Design an enzyme around this catalytic site. Sequence first.
Site, PDB file in Angstrom:
ATOM      1  N   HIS A  41       0.690  -1.388  -0.359  1.00  0.00           N
ATOM      2  CA  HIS A  41       0.315   0.176   0.151  1.00  0.00           C
ATOM      3  C   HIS A  41       1.173   1.231   0.101  1.00  0.00           C
ATOM      4  O   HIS A  41       0.319   2.168   0.324  1.00  0.00           O
ATOM      5  CB  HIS A  41      -0.740   0.163   1.153  1.00  0.00           C
ATOM      6  CG  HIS A  41      -0.599   0.149   2.947  1.00  0.00           C
ATOM      7  ND1 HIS A  41       0.333   1.386   3.069  1.00  0.00           N
ATOM      8  CD2 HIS A  41      -0.026  -0.781   3.468  1.00  0.00           C
ATOM      9  CE1 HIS A  41       0.510   1.000   4.397  1.00  0.00           C
ATOM     10  NE2 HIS A  41       0.048   0.007   4.714  1.00  0.00           N
ATOM     11  N   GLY A 143       2.793   6.204   9.984  1.00  0.00           N
ATOM     12  CA  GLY A 143       4.206   6.041   9.551  1.00  0.00           C
ATOM     13  C   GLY A 143       4.819   4.363  10.013  1.00  0.00           C
ATOM     14  O   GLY A 143       6.423   4.568   9.926  1.00  0.00           O
ATOM     15  N   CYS A 145       4.069   1.239   9.501  1.00  0.00           N
ATOM     16  CA  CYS A 145       4.176   0.223   8.521  1.00  0.00           C
ATOM     17  C   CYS A 145       5.024   0.117   8.364  1.00  0.00           C
ATOM     18  O   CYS A 145       6.009   0.891   7.417  1.00  0.00           O
ATOM     19  CB  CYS A 145       3.160   0.785   7.528  1.00  0.00           C
ATOM     20  SG  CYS A 145       1.177   0.380   8.158  1.00  0.00           S
TER      21      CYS A 145
HETATM   22  C1  LIG Z   1       1.011   2.782   8.340  1.00  0.00           C
HETATM   23  N1  LIG Z   1       1.880   3.581   8.502  1.00  0.00           N
HETATM   24  C2  LIG Z   1      -0.141   2.803   9.138  1.00  0.00           C
HETATM   25  C3  LIG Z   1      -0.231   2.225  10.475  1.00  0.00           C
HETATM   26  C4  LIG Z   1      -1.403   2.574  11.336  1.00  0.00           C
HETATM   27  C5  LIG Z   1      -2.182   3.799  11.810  1.00  0.00           C
HETATM   28  C6  LIG Z   1      -2.020   4.754  13.053  1.00  0.00           C
HETATM   29  N2  LIG Z   1      -1.126   3.656  13.781  1.00  0.00           N
HETATM   30  C7  LIG Z   1      -1.223   2.388  13.006  1.00  0.00           C
HETATM   31  O1  LIG Z   1      -1.166   1.310  13.260  1.00  0.00           O
HETATM   32  N3  LIG Z   1      -1.572   1.522   8.207  1.00  0.00           N
HETATM   33  C8  LIG Z   1      -2.710   2.176   8.181  1.00  0.00           C
HETATM   34  O2  LIG Z   1      -2.667   3.505   8.242  1.00  0.00           O
HETATM   35  C9  LIG Z   1      -3.934   1.558   7.385  1.00  0.00           C
HETATM   36  C10 LIG Z   1      -3.653   1.239   6.266  1.00  0.00           C
HETATM   37  C11 LIG Z   1      -4.561   0.361   5.397  1.00  0.00           C
HETATM   38  C12 LIG Z   1      -3.767  -0.291   4.494  1.00  0.00           C
HETATM   39  C13 LIG Z   1      -3.898  -0.661   5.583  1.00  0.00           C
HETATM   40  N4  LIG Z   1      -5.294   1.431   8.026  1.00  0.00           N
HETATM   41  C14 LIG Z   1      -5.196   1.144   9.308  1.00  0.00           C
HETATM   42  O3  LIG Z   1      -4.569   0.825  10.092  1.00  0.00           O
HETATM   43  C15 LIG Z   1      -7.140   1.621   9.494  1.00  0.00           C
HETATM   44  C16 LIG Z   1      -7.971   2.584   8.915  1.00  0.00           C
HETATM   45  C17 LIG Z   1      -8.706   2.284   9.276  1.00  0.00           C
HETATM   46  C18 LIG Z   1     -10.495   3.219   8.984  1.00  0.00           C
HETATM   47  O4  LIG Z   1     -10.671   3.032   7.589  1.00  0.00           O
HETATM   48  C19 LIG Z   1     -11.850   3.811   7.671  1.00  0.00           C
HETATM   49  C20 LIG Z   1     -11.636   2.665   9.529  1.00  0.00           C
HETATM   50  C21 LIG Z   1     -11.376   2.275  11.529  1.00  0.00           C
HETATM   51  C22 LIG Z   1      -9.783   1.300  11.656  1.00  0.00           C
HETATM   52  C23 LIG Z   1      -8.802   1.385  10.619  1.00  0.00           C
HETATM   53  N5  LIG Z   1      -7.633   1.205  10.803  1.00  0.00           N
END
Ligand SMILES: *C(=N)[C@H](C[C@@H]1CCNC1=O)NC(=O)[C@H](CC1CC1)NC(=O)c1cc2c(OC)cccc2[nH]1
Lengths: 304, 301
Positions: A41, A143, A145
Amino acid sequence: SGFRKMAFPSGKVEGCMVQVTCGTTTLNGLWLDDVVYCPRHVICTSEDMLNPNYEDLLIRKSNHNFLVQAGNVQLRVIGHSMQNCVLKLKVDTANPKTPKYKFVRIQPGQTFSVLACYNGSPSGVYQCAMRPNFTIKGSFLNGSCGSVGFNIDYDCVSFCYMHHMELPTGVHAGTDLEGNFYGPFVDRQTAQAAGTDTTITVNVLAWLYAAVINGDRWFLNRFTTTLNDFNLVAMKYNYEPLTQDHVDILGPLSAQTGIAVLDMCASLKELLQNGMNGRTILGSALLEDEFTPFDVVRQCSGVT
Amino acid sequence: SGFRKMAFPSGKVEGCMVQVTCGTTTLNGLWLDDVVYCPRHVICTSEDMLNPNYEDLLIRKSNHNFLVQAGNVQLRVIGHSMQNCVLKLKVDTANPKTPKYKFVRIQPGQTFSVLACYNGSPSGVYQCAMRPNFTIKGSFLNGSCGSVGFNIDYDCVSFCYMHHMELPTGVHAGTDLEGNFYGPFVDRQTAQAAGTDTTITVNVLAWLYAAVINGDRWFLNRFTTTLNDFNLVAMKYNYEPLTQDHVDILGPLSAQTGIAVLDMCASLKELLQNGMNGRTILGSALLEDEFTPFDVVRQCS
Ligand SMILES: *C(=N)[C@H](C[C@@H]1CCNC1=O)NC(=O)[C@H](CC1CC1)NC(=O)c1cc2c(OC)cccc2[nH]1
Ligand SMILES: *C(=N)[C@H](C[C@@H]1CCNC1=O)NC(=O)[C@H](CC1CC1)NC(=O)c1cc2c(OC)cccc2[nH]1
Ligand code: NA
């Protein structure tokens, strides 16, 4: 003596963390030999996250769209491919700090160390367990991930986790280093729910063996039980069933204390049915379930 | 989100651990520039350990009595001296993995990461706090002496602890990198007791703020207390008093959560007077006091 949640020394993994940027999205990657592994992603923008067609998005990207950086030093990308949810970027420089390593897929209940990184810079290290519902109770921010979890045997680093997602309940989800998710989670910007979590029975038993090793043994009883009857009761108490592997890895602690696995299982079954009655174990009034038998052996004998 | 006991990455410290042997005794040493720091009791025999006259023992040693080993490589010792309980061995090679570093002495309540090593090989890393009675609740076995505790500021490693001893109660004791023990402890082979330990109140408050940031807020209440009345109750329950400086450093967490410090103190006073009632905070049944406010800020932001 003393029992602590202990992580592996992180130097070998630290030497492999890099920063992967596509457009404006920057996350972490793992640089082993001449290949960088990261979450796919990284190629998404916000509007693509909601429902992404990663194949179509990757066909549009070229090698020169990927910025890989060790510190502030750029590593030229000379190839790229997608294995499940992981992006593999072939670079022009073999990492001179590459340790001996393996990619392993751990089972629920196993522990590992997480190196929390941001912009390719390690910020912290902590010990974690893969829950029965295939989530981890980690500590991640924006950040993070691409941060990895790992174990070390002798001098060989077995990478087992790469972070991708945080669920609405605050737990976290990710893949192995082949890009396959733990649990029924998908790398999409959607609120996804995990199944009901349970207690890791083999780890609680390892903790009780750690108790017996240190003199705490009030909870031992006469009784024994069969593995099947114990698993039947344990599932009624929201405890995980015990596998043959679990019985096998409890072997060394059983030999060290002289208490057979099923005897200790009867002890724990009595604990679940009657409670603790005020009494404590290693000071704690709660049964601890994030120490594997290997962790108990490591701290009650010393390893590397 | 999430909250874990988190240690600093240990790579920079791993690059400095070596194995020091004198006679039959082998422990760990810290190799910075062209100097190796280790606990001085490496020069003692089982006979000397009861009442060691360390300067008499040291003048009887020569450079060739000390075997310093970086992995499988001998480091030739060209000098030796003693600074309090720390032996300094000057070698012929400067450690290229030497990071920017400082020697600091930490205060009670402050945290640091411990790199547990054996025979010069790092085995584990975990997070500790300097207890008010100058012990640490570590995890150390035979041969772990010379293991160090540290913090990291940008890229500078502040070494604050070197391990020396385990007390009969199972807690641990050691020195700073200048060889001065934390607490009333002595490097001799005797059973030594510590003073009565107290709870680090400002750390408990920081951890309650961490719990609020992560959703847990059953313990909150509508009440407020003055600083002095809270300190009265806290001292009654064997908690360290809360100073105005402590109140100020909790400022960022109070701003993030919108809960004033004395509001949270009313919550904690109710917790101490009533108990947990079988409930848990961040998965813990006891009040945790080994997270400083800075640790919480660093993890929740
Ligand atoms: C990566 N950098 C990031 C790490 C997250 C953000 C806060 N702490 C973490 O563990 N990952 C994300 O933001 C991911 C990306 C998607 C490909 C998986 N998204 C989420 O973790 C995410 C998105 C949602 C959501 O979207 C509508 C609603 C509820 C929870 C949620 N979590
Ligand atoms: C260093 N390698 C070692 C680390 C100890 C061993 C067990 N776990 C640890 O943390 N340190 C020691 O063995 C020290 C040495 C001191 C002379 C400096 N000794 C003790 O910790 C020690 C000695 C006693 C004792 O002796 C009669 C009685 C009770 C406790 C005790 N602890
Ligand atoms: Na209140």
